[PDB]
Design a protein around this ligand. Structure first.
Ligand SMILES: [Cl-]
Ligand code: NA
Length: 129
């Protein structure tokens, strides 16, 4: 599913991401925009052989099992394919573990390079939340 901006904002809000660990909703919408263009089916392969899955491009080296990343952990305890669903629940739940891990949202390179320090509230402007 390709979400609309306000549609995703409302779904993330319902799943408890607004101000989760201090990060306002606009941060999470901005990250999803630049990681996946709001497309739950997005995948991208990395040079190390791991793959990034779903709306928040969660990586198979640490967070999910895709059966082809030797020596990876599966800290969210899920198949990576479950992250590609039009229901964002599994993605959100796994993102909550990632962002509690110590370096916060810097774990998402696109957030660090394109969202951090910007006016992120613009990503939820206009939405009925
Ligand atoms: Cl933090
Ligand atoms: Na893994």
């Amino acid at each position: 599913k390709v979400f609309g901006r306000c549609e995703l904002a409302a779904a993330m809000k319902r799943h408890g991401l607004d101000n989760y660990r201090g990060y306002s909703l606009g941060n999470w919408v901005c990250a999803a925009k630049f990681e996946s263009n709001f497309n739950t089916q997005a995948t991208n392969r990395n040079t190390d052989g791991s793959t990034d899955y779903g709306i928040l491009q969660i990586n198979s080296r640490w967070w999910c099992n895709d059966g082809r990343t030797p020596g990876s952990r599966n800290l969210c305890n899920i198949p990576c394919s479950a992250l590609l669903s039009s229901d964002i629940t599994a993605s959100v739940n796994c993102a909550k573990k990632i962002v509690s891990d110590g370096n916060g949202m810097n774990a998402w390179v696109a957030w660090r390079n394109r969202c951090k320090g910007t006016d992120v509230q613009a990503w939820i402007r206009g939405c009925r939340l």
